[PDB]
Coordinates of C-alpha atoms in Angstrom, one line a residue:
Chain A
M295 CA 47.5 33.2 70.5
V296 CA 47.8 34.3 66.8
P297 CA 49.9 32.3 64.3
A298 CA 53.4 33.8 63.2
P299 CA 54.1 35.1 59.9
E300 CA 56.1 32.3 58.5
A301 CA 53.5 29.6 59.6
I302 CA 50.8 31.7 57.8
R303 CA 52.9 31.9 54.7
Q304 CA 53.5 28.2 54.9
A305 CA 49.7 27.6 55.1
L306 CA 49.0 29.7 52.4
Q307 CA 51.2 28.3 50.0
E308 CA 50.1 24.8 50.6
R309 CA 46.8 26.2 50.0
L310 CA 47.4 27.9 46.9
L311 CA 49.2 25.0 45.4
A312 CA 46.4 22.7 46.5
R313 CA 43.8 24.9 44.6
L314 CA 45.9 24.6 41.3
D315 CA 46.4 20.9 41.3
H316 CA 45.3 19.0 38.2
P317 CA 46.0 15.5 36.7
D318 CA 47.6 16.9 33.6
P319 CA 51.1 17.4 34.6
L320 CA 51.6 20.3 31.9
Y321 CA 48.4 21.8 32.9
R322 CA 49.5 21.7 36.6
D323 CA 52.9 22.7 35.7
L324 CA 51.3 25.8 34.1
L325 CA 48.9 26.8 36.6
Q326 CA 51.4 26.3 39.5
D327 CA 54.5 27.9 38.1
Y328 CA 54.2 31.3 39.2
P329 CA 53.0 30.4 43.0
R330 CA 56.2 27.9 43.0
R331 CA 58.3 30.9 42.4
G332 CA 57.4 31.8 46.2
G333 CA 57.9 35.2 47.7
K334 CA 56.5 36.9 51.2
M335 CA 53.0 36.8 50.3
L336 CA 52.5 40.1 52.0
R337 CA 49.0 40.8 50.5
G338 CA 47.8 37.5 51.7
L339 CA 49.7 37.9 55.1
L340 CA 48.0 41.4 55.6
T341 CA 44.5 39.8 54.8
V342 CA 45.0 37.2 57.5
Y343 CA 45.9 39.6 60.2
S344 CA 43.1 41.8 59.1
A345 CA 40.8 39.4 59.4
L346 CA 41.7 38.4 62.9
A347 CA 42.0 41.8 63.9
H348 CA 38.6 42.6 63.3
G349 CA 37.5 39.2 64.9
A350 CA 36.8 36.9 62.2
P351 CA 38.1 33.4 62.1
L352 CA 41.7 32.4 61.1
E353 CA 40.2 29.9 58.7
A354 CA 37.9 32.8 56.8
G355 CA 41.4 34.7 56.9
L356 CA 43.2 32.1 55.2
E357 CA 41.0 31.4 52.6
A358 CA 40.4 34.9 51.8
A359 CA 43.9 35.4 51.6
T360 CA 44.6 32.4 49.4
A361 CA 42.1 33.9 47.0
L362 CA 43.8 37.1 47.0
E363 CA 47.3 35.3 46.4
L364 CA 45.6 33.5 43.6
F365 CA 44.7 36.9 42.2
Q366 CA 48.1 38.1 42.3
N367 CA 49.6 35.0 40.7
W368 CA 47.2 35.1 37.7
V369 CA 47.3 39.0 37.3
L370 CA 51.2 38.6 37.0
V371 CA 50.9 36.1 34.4
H372 CA 48.8 38.3 32.2
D373 CA 50.6 41.3 33.0
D374 CA 53.9 39.7 31.9
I375 CA 52.4 38.9 28.5
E376 CA 50.7 42.5 28.3
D377 CA 53.9 44.3 29.5
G378 CA 56.3 42.5 27.6
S379 CA 58.2 41.5 30.7
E380 CA 61.0 38.5 30.2
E381 CA 61.7 37.4 33.5
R382 CA 59.6 37.3 36.7
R383 CA 61.5 36.6 40.3
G384 CA 64.4 35.0 38.7
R385 CA 63.0 33.0 35.7
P386 CA 61.7 33.6 32.4
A387 CA 58.1 34.7 32.4
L388 CA 55.4 32.3 31.9
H389 CA 55.3 33.1 28.2
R390 CA 58.7 32.5 27.7
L391 CA 58.9 29.1 29.0
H392 CA 55.6 27.9 27.3
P393 CA 53.7 29.2 24.0
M394 CA 52.1 32.5 25.0
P395 CA 48.6 31.2 24.3
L396 CA 49.0 28.6 26.7
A397 CA 50.3 30.8 29.5
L398 CA 47.1 33.2 28.7
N399 CA 44.7 30.4 28.9
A400 CA 46.4 29.1 32.3
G401 CA 45.9 32.7 33.7
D402 CA 42.2 32.5 32.9
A403 CA 42.2 28.7 34.5
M404 CA 43.8 30.4 37.8
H405 CA 41.3 33.3 37.6
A406 CA 38.4 30.8 37.4
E407 CA 40.0 28.9 40.4
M408 CA 40.0 32.1 42.4
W409 CA 36.5 32.3 41.8
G410 CA 35.5 28.7 42.9
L411 CA 37.3 29.0 46.1
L412 CA 35.3 32.2 46.7
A413 CA 32.2 30.5 45.9
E414 CA 32.9 27.4 48.0
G415 CA 34.1 29.5 51.1
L416 CA 30.8 31.3 50.8
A417 CA 29.0 28.1 50.6
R418 CA 30.5 27.0 53.5
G419 CA 29.8 30.1 55.6
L420 CA 33.2 31.7 55.9
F421 CA 32.3 34.6 53.3
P422 CA 29.3 36.7 53.2
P423 CA 28.1 37.8 50.2
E424 CA 29.9 41.1 50.5
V425 CA 33.3 39.3 50.1
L426 CA 32.5 38.2 46.5
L427 CA 31.3 41.7 45.7
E428 CA 34.6 43.1 47.3
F429 CA 36.8 40.5 45.0
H430 CA 34.5 41.8 42.1
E431 CA 35.6 45.4 43.0
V432 CA 39.3 44.0 43.2
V433 CA 39.4 42.5 39.8
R434 CA 37.4 45.6 38.1
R435 CA 39.7 48.3 39.6
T436 CA 42.9 46.5 38.7
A437 CA 41.7 45.7 35.5
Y438 CA 41.1 49.4 34.7
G439 CA 44.0 50.4 36.0
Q440 CA 46.1 47.9 33.7
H441 CA 44.2 49.6 31.0
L442 CA 44.9 52.7 31.8
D443 CA 48.6 51.7 32.3
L444 CA 48.7 49.9 28.9
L445 CA 47.2 52.9 27.2
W446 CA 49.7 55.5 28.6
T447 CA 52.6 53.7 27.2
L448 CA 50.9 53.2 23.8
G449 CA 49.9 56.8 23.4
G450 CA 51.0 59.6 21.0
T451 CA 52.1 62.0 23.8
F452 CA 52.5 61.2 27.4
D453 CA 50.6 63.0 30.5
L454 CA 52.9 63.7 33.0
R455 CA 50.6 65.3 35.5
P456 CA 51.1 63.8 39.0
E457 CA 47.1 63.6 39.3
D458 CA 46.8 61.3 36.3
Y459 CA 49.5 58.8 37.6
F460 CA 48.2 58.6 41.0
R461 CA 44.7 57.8 39.6
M462 CA 46.2 55.2 37.5
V463 CA 48.1 53.5 40.1
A464 CA 45.2 53.8 42.7
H465 CA 43.4 51.4 40.5
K466 CA 46.3 49.1 39.1
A467 CA 47.8 48.4 42.4
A468 CA 47.1 50.3 45.4
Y469 CA 43.7 49.4 45.8
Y470 CA 44.2 45.3 45.8
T471 CA 47.5 46.0 47.7
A472 CA 46.4 47.7 50.8
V473 CA 43.1 48.5 50.6
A474 CA 41.4 44.9 49.9
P475 CA 43.1 43.2 52.9
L476 CA 41.8 46.2 55.1
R477 CA 38.3 45.8 53.8
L478 CA 38.2 42.2 53.5
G479 CA 39.2 41.8 57.2
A480 CA 35.9 44.0 58.1
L481 CA 33.7 42.2 55.8
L482 CA 34.6 38.8 56.9
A483 CA 33.5 39.8 60.4
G484 CA 30.4 41.2 59.4
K485 CA 31.4 44.9 59.7
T486 CA 31.0 47.7 57.3
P487 CA 34.6 49.0 56.3
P488 CA 35.0 52.6 57.3
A489 CA 35.9 55.1 54.3
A490 CA 39.2 55.3 55.8
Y491 CA 40.4 51.9 54.9
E492 CA 40.2 53.3 51.2
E493 CA 41.7 56.7 51.8
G494 CA 44.4 55.3 54.0
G495 CA 44.8 52.1 52.0
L496 CA 45.4 53.9 48.7
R497 CA 48.2 56.0 50.4
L498 CA 49.8 52.9 51.6
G499 CA 49.3 51.2 48.2
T500 CA 50.7 53.8 46.2
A501 CA 53.5 54.2 48.6
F502 CA 54.2 50.3 48.1
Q503 CA 54.3 50.9 44.2
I504 CA 56.8 53.6 44.1
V505 CA 59.0 51.3 46.5
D506 CA 58.7 48.4 43.7
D507 CA 59.5 51.0 41.1
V508 CA 62.6 51.8 42.8
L509 CA 63.5 48.2 43.5
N510 CA 63.3 47.7 39.8
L511 CA 65.9 50.0 38.9
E512 CA 68.3 49.1 41.6
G513 CA 70.5 46.0 41.8
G514 CA 69.0 44.2 44.2
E515 CA 67.4 40.6 44.2
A516 CA 65.0 40.8 41.3
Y517 CA 61.6 39.7 43.1
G518 CA 59.4 41.1 40.1
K519 CA 60.3 41.6 36.4
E520 CA 63.6 42.1 35.1
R521 CA 65.9 44.7 36.2
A522 CA 65.1 48.2 34.6
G523 CA 61.9 46.4 33.0
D524 CA 60.1 49.5 33.6
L525 CA 62.6 51.3 31.2
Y526 CA 62.4 48.5 28.5
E527 CA 58.5 48.6 28.7
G528 CA 58.1 52.4 28.7
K529 CA 56.1 52.2 32.3
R530 CA 54.9 55.3 33.8
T531 CA 56.6 55.5 37.4
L532 CA 57.0 58.6 39.6
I533 CA 61.0 58.3 39.5
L534 CA 60.2 59.0 36.0
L535 CA 57.9 61.9 36.3
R536 CA 60.1 63.5 38.8
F537 CA 63.2 63.1 36.5
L538 CA 61.6 64.7 33.7
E539 CA 60.4 67.5 35.8
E540 CA 64.1 68.4 36.9
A541 CA 66.4 66.9 34.4
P542 CA 68.5 69.4 31.8
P543 CA 66.5 70.2 28.8
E544 CA 68.9 67.8 26.8
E545 CA 68.5 65.1 29.0
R546 CA 64.5 65.5 29.3
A547 CA 64.4 65.4 25.6
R548 CA 66.3 62.3 25.3
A549 CA 64.3 60.5 28.1
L550 CA 61.0 61.4 26.2
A551 CA 62.3 60.2 22.8
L552 CA 63.3 56.8 24.1
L553 CA 59.9 56.6 25.9
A554 CA 58.1 56.9 22.5
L555 CA 59.9 54.2 21.5
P556 CA 58.3 50.5 21.6
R557 CA 60.6 48.1 23.5
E558 CA 62.6 46.5 20.5
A559 CA 63.1 49.9 19.1
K560 CA 64.8 51.2 22.5
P561 CA 68.2 51.8 21.8
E562 CA 70.3 49.8 24.3
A563 CA 72.7 52.3 24.9
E564 CA 70.0 54.8 25.7
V565 CA 68.2 52.5 28.0
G566 CA 71.6 51.9 30.0
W567 CA 72.1 55.8 29.8
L568 CA 68.7 56.6 31.6
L569 CA 69.2 53.7 34.0
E570 CA 72.5 55.3 35.1
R571 CA 71.0 58.9 35.3
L572 CA 67.9 57.7 37.2
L573 CA 69.9 55.9 39.9
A574 CA 72.2 59.0 40.2
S575 CA 69.3 61.4 40.3
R576 CA 68.0 63.6 43.2
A577 CA 64.4 62.0 41.5
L578 CA 65.1 59.0 43.0
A579 CA 66.0 60.2 46.3
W580 CA 62.8 62.3 46.1
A581 CA 60.7 59.3 45.0
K582 CA 61.8 57.2 48.3
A583 CA 61.0 60.1 50.3
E584 CA 57.6 60.5 48.6
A585 CA 57.1 56.8 49.4
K586 CA 57.5 57.4 53.0
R587 CA 55.4 60.8 53.1
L588 CA 52.3 58.6 51.7
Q589 CA 52.8 55.9 54.1
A590 CA 52.8 58.4 56.9
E591 CA 49.6 59.8 55.5
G592 CA 48.0 56.4 55.2
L593 CA 49.1 55.8 58.9
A594 CA 47.6 59.0 59.9
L595 CA 44.3 58.2 58.3
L596 CA 43.7 54.8 59.9
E597 CA 45.1 55.2 63.3
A598 CA 41.5 56.5 64.9
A599 CA 39.6 53.6 62.9
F600 CA 42.2 50.8 64.3
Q601 CA 40.7 51.7 67.8
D602 CA 37.8 49.6 66.9
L603 CA 39.7 46.5 66.1
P604 CA 39.4 43.9 69.1
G605 CA 41.8 41.4 68.0
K606 CA 45.0 43.3 69.4
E607 CA 47.7 40.8 68.9
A608 CA 46.4 40.4 65.2
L609 CA 46.6 44.2 65.1
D610 CA 50.2 44.6 66.0
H611 CA 51.0 42.3 63.4
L612 CA 48.9 44.0 60.8
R613 CA 50.6 47.3 61.4
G614 CA 54.1 45.7 61.3
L615 CA 53.0 44.6 57.8
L616 CA 51.5 47.9 56.8
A617 CA 55.0 49.4 57.5
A618 CA 56.8 46.5 55.4
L619 CA 54.6 47.6 52.4
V620 CA 57.3 50.5 52.2
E621 CA 60.3 49.3 54.4
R622 CA 60.0 45.8 53.3
Chain B
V284 CA 6.7 31.9 27.9
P285 CA 8.8 34.7 26.4
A286 CA 9.5 34.5 22.3
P287 CA 13.1 33.6 21.3
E288 CA 12.8 37.0 20.0
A289 CA 12.3 38.9 23.4
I290 CA 14.8 36.9 24.9
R291 CA 17.8 37.6 22.9
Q292 CA 16.8 41.3 23.4
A293 CA 16.8 41.1 26.7
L294 CA 20.2 39.1 26.9
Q295 CA 21.8 41.9 24.6
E296 CA 20.4 44.9 26.4
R297 CA 21.4 43.4 29.9
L298 CA 25.0 42.1 28.4
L299 CA 25.6 45.7 26.9
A300 CA 24.6 47.2 30.6
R301 CA 26.9 45.1 32.4
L302 CA 29.6 46.4 30.3
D303 CA 28.7 50.1 30.2
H304 CA 31.3 52.2 31.6
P305 CA 32.1 55.9 32.4
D306 CA 35.3 55.8 30.4
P307 CA 34.1 56.0 26.8
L308 CA 37.1 54.1 25.3
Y309 CA 37.0 51.2 27.8
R310 CA 33.3 51.1 27.5
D311 CA 33.8 50.7 23.8
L312 CA 36.3 48.2 23.9
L313 CA 34.1 45.6 26.5
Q314 CA 31.1 46.2 24.7
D315 CA 32.8 45.4 20.9
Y316 CA 32.2 41.7 21.0
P317 CA 28.9 42.1 22.1
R318 CA 27.7 44.8 19.7
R319 CA 28.9 42.4 16.9
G320 CA 25.7 40.6 17.6
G321 CA 24.9 36.5 17.6
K322 CA 22.1 34.4 17.8
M323 CA 22.7 33.7 21.6
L324 CA 21.8 30.1 21.3
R325 CA 23.5 28.9 24.6
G326 CA 21.8 32.1 26.3
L327 CA 18.3 30.9 25.0
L328 CA 18.8 27.3 25.9
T329 CA 19.9 28.5 29.3
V330 CA 16.6 30.6 29.7
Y331 CA 14.3 27.9 28.4
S332 CA 15.8 25.3 30.6
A333 CA 15.5 27.5 33.7
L334 CA 11.7 27.9 32.7
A335 CA 11.3 24.3 32.0
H336 CA 12.8 23.3 35.3
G337 CA 10.3 25.9 37.3
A338 CA 12.8 28.7 38.0
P339 CA 11.9 32.3 37.9
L340 CA 12.3 34.0 34.6
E341 CA 14.7 36.6 36.1
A342 CA 17.0 34.1 37.3
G343 CA 16.9 32.6 34.0
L344 CA 17.8 35.7 32.2
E345 CA 20.4 37.0 34.3
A346 CA 22.3 33.4 34.2
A347 CA 22.0 33.5 30.6
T348 CA 23.4 37.0 30.6
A349 CA 26.2 35.7 32.5
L350 CA 26.7 32.6 30.2
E351 CA 26.8 34.8 27.3
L352 CA 29.4 37.1 29.1
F353 CA 31.3 34.1 29.3
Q354 CA 30.8 33.3 25.7
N355 CA 32.1 36.9 24.6
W356 CA 35.6 37.0 26.8
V357 CA 36.4 33.5 25.8
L358 CA 36.2 34.9 22.1
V359 CA 38.4 37.7 22.7
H360 CA 41.1 35.6 24.8
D361 CA 40.5 32.5 21.9
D362 CA 41.1 35.1 19.0
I363 CA 44.3 36.3 20.8
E364 CA 45.4 32.6 21.4
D365 CA 44.7 31.2 18.0
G366 CA 45.7 34.4 15.8
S367 CA 42.2 34.7 14.3
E368 CA 42.3 37.9 12.2
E369 CA 38.9 38.7 12.0
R370 CA 35.5 38.2 14.2
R371 CA 32.3 38.7 12.2
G372 CA 33.5 40.6 9.4
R373 CA 35.9 42.9 11.3
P374 CA 39.3 42.7 12.8
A375 CA 39.5 40.7 15.8
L376 CA 40.0 42.9 19.2
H377 CA 43.6 42.2 19.3
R378 CA 44.2 43.6 15.8
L379 CA 41.6 46.6 16.1
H380 CA 43.4 47.5 19.7
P381 CA 46.9 46.7 20.5
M382 CA 46.8 42.9 22.0
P383 CA 47.8 44.0 25.6
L384 CA 44.6 46.0 25.9
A385 CA 42.4 43.3 24.3
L386 CA 43.9 40.5 26.6
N387 CA 43.0 42.8 29.3
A388 CA 39.5 43.6 28.2
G389 CA 38.7 40.0 28.2
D390 CA 39.8 39.7 31.9
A391 CA 37.5 42.9 32.8
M392 CA 34.8 41.1 30.9
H393 CA 35.2 37.8 33.1
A394 CA 35.4 39.8 36.3
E395 CA 31.7 41.3 35.2
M396 CA 30.5 37.7 34.7
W397 CA 31.3 37.0 38.2
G398 CA 30.3 40.5 39.6
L399 CA 26.7 39.6 37.9
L400 CA 26.7 36.3 39.6
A401 CA 27.8 37.4 43.0
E402 CA 25.2 40.2 42.8
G403 CA 22.6 37.7 41.8
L404 CA 23.5 35.5 44.9
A405 CA 23.5 38.8 47.3
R406 CA 20.0 39.5 46.1
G407 CA 18.8 35.9 46.9
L408 CA 18.2 35.4 43.1
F409 CA 21.1 32.4 42.8
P410 CA 22.0 29.7 45.2
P411 CA 25.6 29.2 45.6
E412 CA 25.2 26.2 43.7
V413 CA 24.8 28.4 40.4
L414 CA 28.4 29.9 41.1
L415 CA 29.9 26.6 41.5
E416 CA 28.4 25.6 38.2
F417 CA 30.2 28.6 36.3
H418 CA 33.5 27.9 37.9
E419 CA 32.9 24.1 36.3
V420 CA 32.1 25.9 33.0
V421 CA 35.2 27.9 32.9
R422 CA 37.6 25.1 34.5
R423 CA 36.4 22.7 31.9
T424 CA 36.5 25.0 28.9
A425 CA 40.2 26.1 29.7
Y426 CA 41.4 22.7 30.0
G427 CA 39.7 22.0 26.6
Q428 CA 41.1 25.0 25.1
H429 CA 44.5 24.1 26.5
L430 CA 44.4 20.7 24.8
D431 CA 43.3 22.2 21.5
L432 CA 46.0 25.0 21.8
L433 CA 48.7 22.5 22.3
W434 CA 48.2 20.4 19.2
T435 CA 47.4 23.4 17.2
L436 CA 50.1 25.6 18.1
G437 CA 52.7 22.8 17.7
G438 CA 51.7 20.8 14.6
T439 CA 50.6 17.9 16.4
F440 CA 47.9 15.8 13.9
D441 CA 48.3 12.2 15.0
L442 CA 45.7 12.1 17.8
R443 CA 42.9 9.4 18.3
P444 CA 39.3 9.7 18.2
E445 CA 39.4 9.4 22.2
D446 CA 41.7 12.5 22.0
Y447 CA 39.2 14.5 20.2
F448 CA 36.5 13.5 22.3
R449 CA 38.1 14.6 25.5
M450 CA 39.3 17.6 23.9
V451 CA 35.8 18.7 22.6
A452 CA 33.9 17.5 25.5
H453 CA 36.0 20.0 27.6
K454 CA 36.2 22.6 25.2
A455 CA 33.0 23.1 23.9
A456 CA 30.3 20.3 24.7
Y457 CA 30.2 21.1 28.5
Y458 CA 29.4 24.8 28.2
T459 CA 27.2 24.5 25.0
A460 CA 25.0 21.8 26.1
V461 CA 25.6 20.9 29.5
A462 CA 25.7 24.0 31.6
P463 CA 22.4 25.4 30.1
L464 CA 20.6 22.1 31.6
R465 CA 22.4 22.1 34.8
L466 CA 21.8 25.6 35.2
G467 CA 18.4 25.6 34.6
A468 CA 18.0 22.7 37.4
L469 CA 20.2 24.6 39.9
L470 CA 18.3 27.8 39.4
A471 CA 15.1 25.9 40.5
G472 CA 16.9 24.6 43.5
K473 CA 17.0 21.2 41.9
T474 CA 19.5 18.7 41.8
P475 CA 20.6 17.9 38.3
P476 CA 20.6 14.2 37.3
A477 CA 24.1 12.7 36.0
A478 CA 22.0 12.5 32.5
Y479 CA 22.6 16.2 32.0
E480 CA 26.5 16.0 31.7
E481 CA 26.2 12.4 30.0
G482 CA 23.7 13.2 27.5
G483 CA 24.6 16.8 27.3
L484 CA 28.2 15.9 26.3
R485 CA 27.0 13.7 23.6
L486 CA 24.8 16.2 22.0
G487 CA 27.4 19.1 22.5
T488 CA 29.8 17.0 20.8
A489 CA 27.6 15.8 17.8
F490 CA 27.1 19.4 17.4
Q491 CA 30.7 20.2 16.5
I492 CA 30.8 17.1 14.5
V493 CA 28.2 18.2 12.4
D494 CA 29.4 21.5 11.9
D495 CA 32.7 20.4 11.0
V496 CA 31.1 17.8 8.2
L497 CA 29.1 20.8 6.9
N498 CA 32.4 23.1 6.3
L499 CA 34.0 20.1 4.1
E500 CA 30.6 19.4 2.2
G501 CA 28.7 22.4 1.8
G502 CA 29.5 26.3 1.8
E503 CA 36.0 29.7 0.3
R504 CA 36.0 25.8 -0.1
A505 CA 36.8 23.9 3.2
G506 CA 38.2 26.4 5.6
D507 CA 38.8 24.2 8.1
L508 CA 41.6 22.3 5.7
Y509 CA 43.4 25.7 5.2
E510 CA 43.4 26.2 9.1
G511 CA 44.0 22.6 9.6
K512 CA 41.2 22.1 12.3
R513 CA 41.6 18.9 14.4
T514 CA 38.4 17.6 13.1
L515 CA 37.2 14.2 13.8
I516 CA 37.0 13.7 10.2
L517 CA 40.5 14.7 9.7
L518 CA 41.8 12.7 12.5
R519 CA 40.1 9.6 11.3
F520 CA 41.4 10.0 7.9
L521 CA 44.9 10.2 9.1
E522 CA 44.4 7.3 11.6
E523 CA 43.7 5.1 8.5
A524 CA 45.5 6.4 5.5
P525 CA 48.1 4.7 3.8
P526 CA 51.6 5.6 4.3
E527 CA 52.0 7.5 1.0
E528 CA 48.6 9.4 1.2
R529 CA 49.2 10.3 5.0
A530 CA 52.6 11.6 4.4
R531 CA 51.1 13.8 1.6
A532 CA 48.4 15.4 3.8
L533 CA 50.7 15.8 6.8
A534 CA 53.0 17.6 4.5
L535 CA 50.2 20.0 3.4
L536 CA 49.2 20.2 6.9
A537 CA 52.6 21.3 8.3
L538 CA 52.4 24.5 6.0
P539 CA 50.8 27.7 7.7
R540 CA 47.4 28.6 5.8
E541 CA 49.1 31.5 4.1
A542 CA 51.5 28.9 2.4
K543 CA 49.2 26.2 1.1
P544 CA 48.5 25.5 -2.6
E545 CA 44.9 25.5 -3.5
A546 CA 45.5 22.4 -5.6
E547 CA 47.0 20.7 -2.9
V548 CA 44.2 21.3 -0.5
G549 CA 41.6 20.6 -3.1
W550 CA 43.1 17.1 -3.5
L551 CA 42.7 16.6 0.5
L552 CA 39.0 17.9 -0.1
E553 CA 38.6 15.2 -2.6
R554 CA 39.9 12.3 -0.6
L555 CA 38.1 13.4 2.4
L556 CA 34.7 13.9 1.1
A557 CA 34.7 10.6 -0.3
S558 CA 36.8 8.7 2.6
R559 CA 35.4 6.1 4.8
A560 CA 36.3 8.5 7.6
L561 CA 33.9 11.1 6.6
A562 CA 31.2 8.2 6.9
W563 CA 32.2 7.2 10.2
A564 CA 32.2 10.6 11.6
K565 CA 28.9 11.2 10.3
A566 CA 27.7 8.2 11.9
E567 CA 29.3 8.7 15.1
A568 CA 27.4 12.4 15.0
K569 CA 24.2 10.6 14.7
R570 CA 25.0 7.9 17.3
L571 CA 25.9 10.2 19.8
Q572 CA 22.9 12.8 19.2
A573 CA 20.7 9.6 19.6
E574 CA 22.2 8.4 22.6
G575 CA 22.1 12.0 24.2
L576 CA 18.5 12.7 23.8
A577 CA 17.5 9.2 25.0
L578 CA 19.6 9.8 28.2
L579 CA 17.6 13.0 28.9
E580 CA 14.3 11.7 28.1
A581 CA 13.1 10.5 31.4
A582 CA 14.3 13.7 33.4
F583 CA 12.5 15.8 30.4
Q584 CA 9.5 14.0 30.8
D585 CA 9.1 15.2 34.4
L586 CA 9.8 19.0 34.1
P587 CA 7.2 21.2 35.1
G588 CA 7.4 23.9 32.6
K589 CA 6.0 22.2 29.5
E590 CA 5.7 25.0 27.3
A591 CA 9.5 26.0 28.0
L592 CA 10.5 22.5 27.7
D593 CA 8.9 22.4 24.1
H594 CA 11.1 25.2 23.2
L595 CA 14.2 23.5 24.8
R596 CA 13.7 20.5 22.9
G597 CA 13.5 22.2 20.0
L598 CA 16.8 24.4 20.5
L599 CA 18.7 21.0 21.2
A600 CA 17.4 19.3 18.2
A601 CA 18.8 21.8 15.8
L602 CA 22.2 23.1 17.2

């Protein structure tokens, strides 16, 4: 049968760490630090079951998933430096445990290892050339999305149009999170992915991001950056956009004035005030409902295409994990 | 065989095209360092190496473009990492732009290097072995940079020659002198001999030592001193200097560039330019250069592209 999710998670973790092993203890420490913080590895699991559902070999699925999880990890090391995040999954960010230059460089080394794994998997016949082209698209789109995200925070004014936000998140997070796993599965099987994988996947991946943003404001276990990190960092989120659209004039102005200040200049009392307002706002409830609406739209767009997947047991798992993008 | 000028032109055009983008601001950010120009010596070495080995010119040009893309994103990140204020007369990318945007630009540039390689492989222009070599290029360079940053950022100066050699072999010698040779063979579907790494690392290292010797002798006066660069000369000096003189040098080196007297630096410069360490360093560079060339002779004499080999030998002799 198909492996259970925990067995896949354990395998991906072992493989990820093995790709980042190094004889220099400090260097190995740097490379493996973020992977060692653990996590559900949802993107990796989606990739493995997507591969199996399309009829591609388990080994090919595991290696492609290992590459995507390596991507997730180096992207977070650099994002934490770029975003000014202090924490990552319960521990200080890498550039707060070590000199920032060493963390920046470690991220580059990890990125190189992702491509090394891809070149090796291709040489062995597990990856068609198209898989490497897909990973190029993954890094290219993600980097451009991060560029748009950073530029928004640093601008003289703030574009609040939903369309601008959705374009950014589609590149920054939605594509690699939900579209790539689907496309990779088809590519590994020598199948041209249907256009619906990107259309439906972007909806699912955007819903995923909205949920991450909700979780960042709430007081649950901090799986990502520090709680309220989006407020300290001036990150655009759908919750913030909806709040600004509905808030009393005084509150809207106060939130926008806070947004214009760099992290260190944001008054602590004002960050606390905004966090309280957002958690109690109709905007938060609206964002949660919006994530579910987008999830539904994505499922609608993928249902017909999923009829063509031969690995039915794997497909059951894939549908379950796609649901987990929003329900967790 | 194309003239160096024609090759430099082609690489520059290909480099900018690989970094063009529909978003003008993003395009400008990615193309910035490339548009600052340069001799593109590593790219030239790669193209002539490809031709010397009998590889198709197009394969040599694309691989060299990838190596020059590597050089550019590495400089972007290096500048952030070491705090360099300027690059070729203008503010560094992370000075001109917010550092986060420059950091990300470097990642995007690195992504395009692999995109170029992946597309070349898909078209049948590159064998997978070429991508494995680029993986080695980034892997070694990053580890070398890790060592150099570790020492520099934390004020460590008591390093042995062995430490210097290990760091420079990884940080610079490999991608500068070894990769162009191995890539040439790989692009032609040939197995690179072990001499390419052994001889290439010696040449690439000799290259660095001579440059450091130049900054001290010829010509600001001795810029590597105000920066406290861990050169073989400075490390050898410290390895042998008497307690009092060693203490004085380290005291000066402990101070940031912006806070060290011209007189105190001039003092160190005087002792270095006339030290046995400087003489030893020069001899080491000459030894390594001669050994490196000798190791490569047999393989070179058997290469099919004689005209290209002429150019290759010439570039390696200069450096």
